[PDB]
């Protein structure tokens, strides 16, 4: 069976989205630099350590899906300078997203999360994303362009033995799922900073951690059209932090109005014909 | 041709959504009381008067669709006590919305707007709503349940001569639009407080104002699944105003997290497994 196509973030940029469109997955080598990965890891470290189980009794929105050996931390903008500056303004991310979502219009972050899998974490069942938050997606026609995509960025090594992600190539075009099996999968073997890019229709799963010693970490960035509601809110992020961001990063976090691709677009999150940012006196790129 | 079915808000409540599901439209008689209509009108009056043309050069999100004789005012919560208290907590509205959207989960306000049409306002072209903001909707399968609905509430009389809304009954099920004509329409003749309820697939239009003297006004409430982004933002509404509202009204305006209907729903607009309202210390029902 054919492996996941691998591409350069530096040279093959225009080829990334067409590759995913065809195969349902691609590995973007050095999507983030080792320096960005280092700072990201340092900044999120304590928040991963304090995170309780996904379905903790203290939560009003528990995640009953994820294993007890998974820790997921979202709303990263207030935690991580590297995320809010470097990741949210990534030239590579934005080229891919504009390639993917031009039919629909503006896109934003549905969820940016660090996931850490403890040693001996079991394999997830094969799945498509978005089914526990956006039931609407299952009612889209088969030829509808993908309305979200997921960048799974390695923040530590992804190996066969430590639970590297499985994907089924071509499964983004599957209508009948009688042939879903781990037999049909290939692995996303990745170094820190590499990214596995999949669509919301790509069948995939986290792999089994089999060493009992290694802790695998990733940054999952689900980017989606601004017509779909994010999984996470940035409504409680302090205004000083938001005002430190670029206008583009503000838009990605829902601190700006949005536009569809319709010729005479009337807009999303508008206030009597004016934008959020105009109405609220919203500054940008103001150092903290 | 058969007229738009008319129903009581008081007696026929359970029949309203099934009627719209079958015919694509229904008139809800006395949806709002004359007292609510009176207060609504009084409170929005000055904001309608100051509203510039839909595509005013001062706007960064101009509406190039609506006629120059249309005035539309959205984000009504800060303007109108009657809207934020009586309309947003309407028992009738909430029964209909929960009937309509149970397959998907929580619903919220995509836009609540007062529209005032000046004398001699021309008929709008026949259309479906949502095509200038949510291109995603056109890619839904034909049998997908409606993802938004629109309550067109008369705030003044709707007559044949003053431009009462036209609808084509059954047009919510049309795939081929070769037979779209004003010949196929019937009128929503309504007294103040009556509501025309349509789906996002119902073909309809504003009528021609032919008297040259009458000013027609309506309250349009587009309710949609919480998975779709609103046309309007309440992000700039003062916290005292938001904290005066019921928890249900807060949710409708995007000042709460949301849930899908998936068995083990993971939620929308969540903050690390917790809701907006829990995270932000959000009070409710605090008098202004
Ligand atoms: C449930 N679930 C998440 O929580 C998740 C986590 C990170 C990024 C995306 C994301 N979206 C999802 O739909 C997944 C789906 C899933 C996960 C494990 C096992 C079965 C299904
Ligand atoms: C453009 N447009 C609005 O502005 C509008 C106004 C009030 C409530 C819903 C709404 N949504 C829409 O999609 C309509 C569509 C339309 C209007 C006039 C002529 C052709 C098409
Ligand atoms: O652990 C992984 O590599 C995949 C995680 C995933 O697909 C998910 O949680 O949705
Ligand atoms: O004017 C009316 O009654 C209908 C208005 C309408 O359909 C619209 O603006 O979308
Ligand atoms: Ni997944
Ligand atoms: Ni309309």
Swiss-Prot record, chains A, B:
GO terms classed as biological process: biosynthetic process
Transmembrane residue ranges: none
Pathway: Secondary metabolite biosynthesis; Alkaloid biosynthesis; Mycotoxin biosynthesis
EC code(s) of this entry: 1.14.11.81
MF-aspect GO terms: dioxygenase activity; metal ion binding
Annotated keywords: Dioxygenase, Iron, Metal-binding, Oxidoreductase
UniProt-annotated binding residues for Fe cation: 127, 129, 204
Names of the cofactor(s): Fe cation
Top-tier EC class: oxidoreductase
Reaction equation(s) it catalyzes: (-)-4'-methoxycyclopeptine + 2-oxoglutarate + O2 = (Z)-4'-methoxydehydrocyclopeptine + succinate + CO2 + H2O; (Z)-4'-methoxydehydrocyclopeptine + 2-oxoglutarate + O2 = (-)-4'-methoxycyclopenine + succinate + CO2; (-)-cyclopeptine + 2-oxoglutarate + O2 = (Z)-dehydrocyclopeptine + succinate + CO2 + H2O; (Z)-dehydrocyclopeptine + 2-oxoglutarate + O2 = (-)-cyclopenine + succinate + CO2
Cited function: Iron/alpha-ketoglutarate-dependent dioxygenase; part of the gene cluster that mediates the biosynthesis of the aspoquinolone mycotoxins. Within the pathway, the iron/alpha-ketoglutarate-dependent dioxygenase asqJ acts as a (-)-cyclopenine synthase that converts 4'-methoxycyclopeptin into 4'-methoxydehydrocyclopeptin through dehydrogenation to form a double bond between C-alpha and C-beta of the O-methyltyrosine side chain.
Complex and partners: Homodimer.
Family: Belongs to the PhyH family.
Protein name: Iron/alpha-ketoglutarate-dependent dioxygenase asqJ
UniProt organism field: Emericella nidulans (strain FGSC A4 / ATCC 38163 / CBS 112.46 / NRRL 194 / M139) (Aspergillus nidulans)
Residues of the full protein shown: 116 to 403 of 416
């Amino acid at each position: 069976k054919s492996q996941i196509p691998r591409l350069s973030a530096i040279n093959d940029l225009h080829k990334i989205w067409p590759t995913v469109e065809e195969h349902g997955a691609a590995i973007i080598e050095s999507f983030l630099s080792l320096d960005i990965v280092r700072r990201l890891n340092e900044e999120v470290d304590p928040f991963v350590k304090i995170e309780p189980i996904p379905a903790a009794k203290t939560k009003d929105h528990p995640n009953h899906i994820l294993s007890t050996t998974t820790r997921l931390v979202n709303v990263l903008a207030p935690i991580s300078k590297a995320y809010r500056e470097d990741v949210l303004n990534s030239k590579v991310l934005h080229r891919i997203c504009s390639d993917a979502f031009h039919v629909y219009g503006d896109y934003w972050v549905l969820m940016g999360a660090v996931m850490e899998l403890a040693p001996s974490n079991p394999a997830q069942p094969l799945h498509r994303d978005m089914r526990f938050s956006h039931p609407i997606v299952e009612y889209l026609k088969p030829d509808a362009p993908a309305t979200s995509i997921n960048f799974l960025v390695a923040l530590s090594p992804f190996t066969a033995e430590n639970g590297a992600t499985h994907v089924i190539l071509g499964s983004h075009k599957w209508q009948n799922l009688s042939n879903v099996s781990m037999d049909a999968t290939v692995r996303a073997l990745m170094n820190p900073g590499d990214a596995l890019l999949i669509t919301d229709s790509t069948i995939h799963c986290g792999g089994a951690e089999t060493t009992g010693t290694e802790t695998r970490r990733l940054l999952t960035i689900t980017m989606g059209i601004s017509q779909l509601t994010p999984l996470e809110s940035n409504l409680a992020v302090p205004r000083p932090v938001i005002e430190s961001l670029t206008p583009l990063a503000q838009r990605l976090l829902g601190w700006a109005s949005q536009r569809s691709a319709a010729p005479r677009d009337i807009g999303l999150l508008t206030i009597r014909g004016n934008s959020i940012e105009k109405t609220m006196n919203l500054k940008a790129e103001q150092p903290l």
